Amino acid sequence: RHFVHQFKGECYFTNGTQRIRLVTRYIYNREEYLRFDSDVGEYRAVTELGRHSAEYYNKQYLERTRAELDTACRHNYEETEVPTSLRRLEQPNVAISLSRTEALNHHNTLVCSVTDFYPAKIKVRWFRNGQEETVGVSSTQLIRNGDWTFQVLVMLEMTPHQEVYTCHVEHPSLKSPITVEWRA
Amino acid sequence: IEADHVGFYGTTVYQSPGDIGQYTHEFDGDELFYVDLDKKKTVWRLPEFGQLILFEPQGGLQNIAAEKHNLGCLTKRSNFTPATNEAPQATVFPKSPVLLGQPNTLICFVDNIFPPVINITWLRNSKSVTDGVYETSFLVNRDHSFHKLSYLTFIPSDDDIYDCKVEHWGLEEPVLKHWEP
């Protein structure tokens, strides 16, 4: 038999620190039983396991827990995330591969691999002879590598004829977009 | 909850038996640091962040002690209801497009981990590989399970086959996820 307890402190930020919401969670195994939520303003029992806990936490800790919206959430964001997490900029690498061996008049997929970028915001577009492609484009979910970089693969359904295909990538880390060409 | 950014601060896990604890911060879903509880040291995922930002480990040790206490109270109050073992799910993918002869990293992403005890190991041609490997902390999920990533740095070759092997109490047999160029 194994037993687990978790505590989660969560600071949600909108428009910098103009809007902050603090949520703390007390969890037994995987059951959240007690929660503070700054939008509520007090602790509440989430399940019966926390029924008598919520009154005690409100009586003993509530002023400190509310104060943490400023002393922890706002402080950590303005003083420490602004100069580290929020200024990190990693430029994407862009490569194009064909899914299947190239054959005239045969269906294929062009894959634009966009890798190692940060932050997550990115715009990837496929072009054919300068014409943006709408239908036949698909994308993997954004893949979190766990090392503070992302990757995404953007696919284009196509059929090689006779001409030129371009993957186009815009990202906050780039002064100008990246373009990579493939010729049929 | 919609937001532009999310910080996870004070994040603490404690488990018994075994006195297993973890303290982490995260920002927008990536690990800022964990506190090494044996060495009482803050270990930042990006070292340059920790050169600029101080986290005193005592704050992590205090939360760990409070969670050890809370684990004690809640196990008794639940009448010693034990954790349910989940079956983790694993996937392997490369960090960058694979080119023979060019260094790369295999990433074994393991999800639905609960309780947070696991053994993730790599095999090359069915033989254990440990040099250079590193893994993340247990990163929290919204459903209060965990995920973890392991990294194998390697040079791709046509003659090498890789597996990520995952052992966990919620698996009858070890999970083996294959990858090759």
């Binding site: 505590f7 402190g9 600071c11 603090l22 703390t24 007390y26 008598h52 806990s53 005690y56 936490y57 003993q60 800790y61 400190r64 827990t65 943490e68 002393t71 922890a72 959430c73 402080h75 950590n76 003083e79 420490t80 100069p83 | 601060y9 004070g10 603490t12 911060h25 800022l32 600029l52 930002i53 101080l54 986290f55 005193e56 704050g59 992590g60 205090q62 939360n63 409070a66 969670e67 206490h69 809370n70 004690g72 109270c73 809640l74 008794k76």
Partner: peptide, 13 residues
């Protein structure tokens, strides 16, 4: 510059 914990508070038992 220092980042701060959100504090785990103690259950009453």
């Amino acid at each position: 510059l220092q980042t701060l914990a959100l504090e785990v508070e103690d259950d009453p038992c």
